[PDB]
């Protein structure tokens, strides 16, 4: 139940994007194969190191989780942007993962 | 009519979900297999251990058990979240049991 | 005419629900077969035994039985729940009976 | 034009209901055959002995009998119970009888 | 022109219902054959005797007599009972006659 | 153009009716058979004998007569009855004649 | 163009009907065959004798006469009764006549 | 151009109505064969003779006459009676004549 | 163009009508056969004579003269009558000519 | 263009209607045949002669001639009358002439 | 392009009409053949010579010629009369000419 | 584009309309064969002479003249006359002309 | 892209039209053949000599131009009159040329 | 992407319009083939020379340019003319170019 | 995942745009083949050099980019213009590019 889920964040024109904090958190919860049936959704998670990487090991349900990182700002409704948040389902192998995105179909 | 209903609950990036309180009761009034014939509801339990682990053996009845472990907060009817509470059939064996969940279909 | 009653009571987790007030009385007046033919409502009874068990004989008619041993509390019509009484009409035999419910079909 | 009417009115879980005021009276006047053809309704009779049993020899006609042994109480309209009267019609023979009855068809 | 019109009154369970005041009327005026037409309506009669019995031998015409022997009370429109009158057409004949009801079809 | 109208009027339980006024009128003039052409209405009589009886002799014509034997009392149009008059049409013979009655057909 | 008129007028129980006042009169003018073509309306005539007859002798015409010998009493228009007046057409012979009515057809 | 008139008048019971009034006029002009072709209305004569006869020769036109001979009293509007005239059309011959009336067809 | 108009006016009962004014008068122009032809209208002559005779000779045109001899009352459009006068078409001829009226068709 | 226009008036009884004033006029303008081409209306002439007779000779137009000779009296429009004047058109010969008139066809 | 216009003019009986104003007036302009193509309306002359003849020598053209001898008076449109003026179209040639009218066709 | 316009206007009974103002005036402007093409409208010319006659020599363009010699009067849109001006269009020729009018077809 | 447009204006009876102002605009902007094409409107030009001629040789596009060489006078609105300008498209060749009009179809 | 775009301005009756201010600027930006893919709009140049030629090389894109040489006048919405602007589609060519024009189709 | 974006931007009659700030930004975010996979939109660089030539290379992805170089002035929503913003989607290659324009289609 167990798979790392190395990323790359090096976003301008080359740059790495160092440092900045990163935030995931699970919709709602979801049983995976036997031993990890429970999962209620919570958040945790900051920092994103120089080479714009970060690491955790528990995808093995079949939910959806949801990746905020950016950080912006936002006011009364008038501001239906400057958010980039994605998706993701849980993938379940016992392997380095990438991409693995839910963009707009 | 006795079934033990071990179940694990480690929860966040591989940790155990060391002790917290735990409830579970029964919705309504149901009857098993001659013996053990009439089990009003009624609610008991606390504690989860260091392996996030529970265990009794009456599930004999036809009727719908909830399980409510996860302590929250709650307002004025604006609050329709931070609840994850679940529910889960009476099985009917003489053997360990796992999973059995009756999440959204 | 007579027909013994027992029944088992032993409620939560294996325990045997030890000596609690029992109640139980006729819904309508009914005849049996013959000899004991008339049988207007009333009520009696009290306590239940270390074992969660009691016994009379007289069921022979055909009219219904109904059970209220839980003592709870209600208030004004914004209690429709709390009381777990069932019914179960007059079985007609000379043997140890059980079970013979009436629940929600 | 003489027809015993014993009857059993042991009650409670065997108990034979002992001494107790017993009423009985004709609901409108009716004609027999020849010898006894009149008959306008009146009322009489008390007490039940212990072994709850009652007994009179004239029911000859066609009319309908009312029994209204159980005394209770009553008040404004809010009480449509409480009272366990049956009703009859004339039996027609030289031998006990029994039964019986006229309950809701 | 003449018919004795002998009749047993014994209502209470087998009592012969001793002396009380007896009341017969004819409803209107009718011809009887030959020897005896006219008779206007007319009103008579009292006393039961101990065996209730009443006899007069006019009854040769075609029209209804009515007998209203018991005794009672009435009050404003709000009592339409506790009276027991009962009718019978004349009959024609010489010899005892008994019975000769007219109630409720 | 004579015919005796003899009649019997013993009314109550075979009593006779002695000596009682007696009243007769014609209705409206009416002819016979030629020599008795004319008979303008107009009343007479009294009296009725012990017998009840009474006779005249000149019903020839061919009109209607009513009789009104009995006296009674009446009020303002709230006594529709205690008046028991009859009428009769005029019969023509020579012979003692009887009955002869036109009540409601 | 004569013809007598002759009428008999003994009303009550065979009774003559002695001296009472007698009326006639012409209704509208009329002609007879030939010699007595005029005739205008008049009235004339009293007294009807003991027997009870009157006669006259000018009947030839083809009119009606109108007969109202009975005196009585007349009030406002509420008593359209107690007059027995009554007619009859004109005859046309030499004999002795009688009846010749016209009463209600 | 002449036709006397000779009638007869004699109204009452074989009387022959003497001396009275007699009244004679033309209702419109007419005109005769030849001679005598003019006549205006006009009014004339009196008395009716013992024997009531009244005579006259000027017939010969084919107007209408109109004979008024009684005397009565009138009133306004009330009394559309007591008038007994007649008409008669004008006749043409030389002999005597009679009747020839124009009452009601 | 002359035709002598001789006429008789002897009116009542063979009286010939002496001296009385007489009228007469052309209604409109009209013209006769040739020598005659012109004709307006004017009126003129008085007198009947004893024998109630007129006569003129112009009578040869074709238009129509009235005639209105007789004197009498007249008032305010309610005697529509009293006037008896008559009207004549003119006569062509030469000898004496006498009725030719034109009285209501 | 030419023509004498000789013409009689004697009127009343044979009467030559002596001197009285004549008047004549033309309608409107008209033209003859070639040489009496124009003749615009005027009027003219008086006197009519003892033996009523007129004469003028330029009739020889087309048009109407109008003649009133009468004199009479008017009013306010409530004499449409009194006045008898005639219209004759144009005759065209050479000879006496006379009628030629245009009365009411 | 010239015509004489002799006319005649004796209107009274054959009297010749002297000496009276004469008008004429040209209606509107028109051309006749060639030489005298122009011809405004004008108006000229007086007098008509004892015996009513008038002459001018100018009609040629195609126009309507208008004549209003007749001087007489006029008010205010209540007299549509009086005047007798009449028209005539050009004639075209070379003699003397007369008549040519225009009248009511 | 020479044409000289010689006209008469000997108006009145012969008389040659001597010396008199005349006026003319060009329409709209008009293009004429080649070399006088343009011919803005202008007004000029005086005088008729003493046989009235007037000449000038330029019609060879396409457009209307108009020609309003005569003088009078005029006044506020109540005098729709008086005024005998005519149109003509422009000959196209080298000779002498006349009439050319174009008086309302 | 030359072209003279040498024109003449004797406007009165042959009169030349001696020296008057001239004045001719471009209406809108157009292109020749290549080498000429740009011509924006523009205005100049005065006098039109003794003969009425005036010259100019640009003309080689295809628009329009219109002339207004007559002086008139104007005011506010009522005077849409005693303006005779003209128009003319732009002619396209190396010869003189003439008339070239554009005079109502 | 060199085009000189050489023009004539000789605008009035062959007179060269020395000099005089002279614009020019792009519509809209565009691309041309490949190298020179930008050009944003924008406004240059003045001076028109004596000859009046312009001449600049860079027309290579696709766009839309306006020339705006004529300075003129303009207010307030009410002067839709007195400008003269033109406009001309891009060229593409390494040539003398001329016309290439957009006036209206 | 690197492409130069070499580009020109000579705008004005061959000159070469010298320094002047330049912006782009990316649209939204998106995703390439494989290892650049994220990139959230943000702004950046400056200056665009003397030959008007900027280049970066990180062109992988498959959103669309904006450039936005002109510096302008807006105002309040009645300046829909003055700016020349283009837009251009992300090329995948490795090697020069340029136009890759995205111009009204």
């Given at each position: 139940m167990t798979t790392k889920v190395i990323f790359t964040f090096h976003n301008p024109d080359g740059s790495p994007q160092a440092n900045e904090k990163f935030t995931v958190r699970l919709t709602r919860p979801g049983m995976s194969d036997a031993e990890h049936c429970v999962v209620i959704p919570e958040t945790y998670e900051m920092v994103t190191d120089a080479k714009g990487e970060f690491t955790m090991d528990l995808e093995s349900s079949t939910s959806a989780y949801r990746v905020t990182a950016i950080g912006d700002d936002d006011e009364?409704?008038?501001?239906?942007?400057?958010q980039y948040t994605f998706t993701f389902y849980v993938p379940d192998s016992a392997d380095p993962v990438y991409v693995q995105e839910l963009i707009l179909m």
């Open positions: 009364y409704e008038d501001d239906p942007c400057s």
